[PDB]
Design a protein around this ligand. Structure first.
Ligand SMILES: CCCCCC(=O)OC[C@H](C)[C@@H](O)[C@]1(C)CC[C@H]([C@]2(C)CCC(C)(C)O2)O1
Ligand SMILES: CCCCCC(=O)OC[C@H](C)[C@@H](O)[C@]1(C)CC[C@H]([C@]2(C)CCC(C)(C)O2)O1
Ligand code: NA
Ligand code: NA
Lengths: 269, 269
């Protein structure tokens, strides 16, 4: 029942209720048995009970969220939004430093934590959050920690460089042979580089140009997340606002890809 | 750019002044040394002298035009509009009847002549008609006038039937190996049956479905004029309004195609 625009707005409502401070209002946005991965790569968080345990100390640290303009998915459930986070070091910082994500500051009472994360929200038809994956890693966080997940981060930027030059074969060198490439998420995926070569052949055909915002990884680097802005010149110039999620294999190749972009994310220029 | 809007307004104005009847008001639209081909395939018409003479017998027969929504070209000069007209038989009637374009009616004082034609108007920076082409043939005229013109008119529909079916090879057979495909008119033209396949492969993938209006020809059956309404499903639904001008060789294949459609002729839905 919920279309792209309404899920897009509910995502912004989530970030606004995080900034208000009302804890009960945030928990009301989730399903009673909802699952939360914050960060992705760590064990999830299930239930309203566990959600108060996760969001209460964040509100104590005065979490402030500048949210990007969200994008939706063509599957009636998914909306994705980027979250620029700032917060006081206490009380969440000490836990981050214990896990090895920050280095403890000299003044833990005046320090601040900056964080860039990409949320992948799944909602049912009623607006309730059934699942929220929040992707961010050490290179997406202050403290001083990038352990050559940078090399895995760069894979998201190498794709844009190769496809901008027409090097179709170099683009295919970034993924495994069993590549599953959902684009857009909601339509049936392409499987095998034979299918993907057809896709990339048609990209350079109508002259696409890709520009990625700084990517983010999961806390275990199995996923690289890319917000790109694809511009095509044919049929007549257009602009795409997309967020993609690659799953990396053992050796850092592209296993599965989920290009999230909705109908309301294309624009006439 | 939206100087196309201006060129479209003048094309309607030319049809509006033919409706008016003031022979001088109509000619104030043509440049001093303009050229008119009405019908195309017949010797040209240069200067206001032969312009006052070409429109005097037609304005006498009480010529009235019914104009369709015009279509501009992406080259700053052109504007195309479909024109349906009706007029009295006398006095221009016996001229068409002598040429073989009509049969003489049994009551020339009451009879009327209907016409469907495509106006191709080339203007300058000021807006004066420097060169106007009017495409219409014998099957585009009343009376009773042939099995080949029908066949040459059909390829405008066979092109549409095969592209909606995904028959890329069947579309390519409709043209010569010399084929120059100006799609759109203005941006660089596709040359060769391999530059065309790339465009057609991009077409079937975008989901193009074309439905043409009843075509017209030139009086010599060398040009076929196809007004189409082309719709694509991907990346996202939009509708084009093109008017194509096809150049046919001796054996009946298309050697040069001019797909006139401006940036002001695309609409999302
Ligand atoms: C780092 C991994 C993410 C990878 C980054 C990524 O997925 O961006 C590429 C975008 C999504 C691209 O699919 C798209 C914009 C969607 C379709 C369109 C086009 C070429 C034009 C028409 C058609 C259907 C033939 O396809 O182009
Ligand atoms: C009968 C001759 C005119 C031919 C009619 C014609 O050009 O329609 C083809 C459409 C426009 C096609 O160019 C496009 C939408 C542009 C890139 C992709 O598909
Ligand atoms: Na860090
Ligand atoms: Na006829």
């Amino acid at each position: 029942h919920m279309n792209e625009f309404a899920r897009k707005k509910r995502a912004l409502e989530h970030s606004r209720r995080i900034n208000a401070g009302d804890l009960d209002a945030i928990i009301d946005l989730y399903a009673p048995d909802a699952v939360l991965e914050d960060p992705v790569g760590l064990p999830p968080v299930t239930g309203h009970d566990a959600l108060r345990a996760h969001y209460e100390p964040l509100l104590a640290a005065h979490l402030r969220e500048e949210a990007a303009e969200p994008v939706a998915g063509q599957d009636a459930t998914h909306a994705l939004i980027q979250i620029s986070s700032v917060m006081d070091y206490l009380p969440v910082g000490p836990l981050y430093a214990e896990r090895g994500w920050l280095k403890a500051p000299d003044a833990p009472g005046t320090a601040r934590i900056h964080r860039t994360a990409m949320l992948v929200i799944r909602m049912d038809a009623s607006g309730l959050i059934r699942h929220l994956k929040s992707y961010w890693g050490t290179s997406d966080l202050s403290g001083g920690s990038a352990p050559d997940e940078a090399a895995r981060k760069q894979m998201a930027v190498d794709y844009a460089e190769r496809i901008n030059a027409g090097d179709i074969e170099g683009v295919l060198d970034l993924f495994t042979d069993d590549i599953v490439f959902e684009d857009p998420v909601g339509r049936p995926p392409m499987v095998g580089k034979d299918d993907l070569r057809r896709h990339l052949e048609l990209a350079v055909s109508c002259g696409t140009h890709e520009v990625p915002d700084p990517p983010m990884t999961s806390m275990d680097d199995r996923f690289v997340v890319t917000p790109t802005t694809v511009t095509v010149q044919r049929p007549r110039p257009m602009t795409f606002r997309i967020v993609g999620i690659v799953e990396l294999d053992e050796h850092g190749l592209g296993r599965r890809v989920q290009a999230f972009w909705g109908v309301t994310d294309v624009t006439m220029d």
